[PDB]
Structure 1
Amino acid sequence: EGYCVDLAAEIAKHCGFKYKLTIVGDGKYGARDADTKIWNGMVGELVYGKADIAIAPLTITLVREEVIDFSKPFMSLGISIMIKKPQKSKPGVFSFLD
């Protein structure tokens, strides 16, 4: 029970069908093999007939759209910055000139 679980439960409501919350045995995403040239993860499961839909945050791109028709993104990602919270530093000497 999470975000994608509720998303799939809401999608199956507007689109009536029978679905089973299967989990991928590899735990990876769409990655083209160097020499084998075979997909893996959810893309590898959908390209070889293992699941019907992938309710998961898959980053859409050019290498994946050529083999799996994606949909409109339900959320947008972003390369953000994280830092420690700006706590009060230790007041050094000459602090009366503030």
Structure 2
Amino acid sequence: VTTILESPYVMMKKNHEMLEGNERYEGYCVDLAAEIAKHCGFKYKLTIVGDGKYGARDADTKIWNGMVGELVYGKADIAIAPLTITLVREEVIDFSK
């Protein structure tokens, strides 16, 4: 599960240094992840996107970046974050309601 560090959706817990795995993070999307995983029945590993971007497309290189990118290039299986549902993205990936 890929996600971005954006309060109050996904934030670093107080004693995140003394924690590991998914317990390190807390927020709206962090809870939303557990809920989705419960109704879909699957284990997950919360990971922060590298470049820390959402999902844009460089005109020149025509390359996707951020979470939307990590989805198209098989880096992640799903994106649980404040990702805006745009036409430019709906063409390359799938957006739930």
* TM-score (normalizing by structure 1): 0.71
Measure how far apart 1:4 and its partner are: 0.1
Equivalent AA in structure 1 for residue 84 of structure 2:
T
Larger helix percent: 2
Residue identity over aligned pairs, in percent, reads 100
Q: In 1, Cα distance between the equivalents of 2:77 and 2:60?
A: 27
Q: Match for residue 72 of structure 2?
A: 47
**Structure 1 residue runs of 4+, over 6 Å off?**
none
Q: Tell me if 1:17 matches 2:4.
A: no
Gaps (5+ residues) in structure 2?
Answer: 1-25
Q: Which amino acid aligns with 1:36?
A: T
Matched residue type, 1:50:
K
Matched ranges for 1:13-92 at <5 A: 13-72=38-97
Cα distance, 1:56 vs structure 2: 0.3
- CA distance in 1 between partners of 2:47 and 2:55 (Å): 17
Q: Which structure ranks higher in relative contact order (CA pairs < 8 Å, sequence separation ≥ 6)?
A: 2
Aligned residues: 72
Equivalent residue letter for 1:17: F
Q: RMSD of the TM alignment (CA)?
A: 0.7
Consecutive unaligned residues in structure 1, runs of 5 or more: 73-98
| Residues 9-65 of structure 1 deviation map (CA, whole Å, 9 limit, x = unaligned) | 011111111210111111001111121001000011000001111110111111000
TM-score when scaled to structure 2? Answer: 0.72
Q: Which has the higher strand share?
A: 2
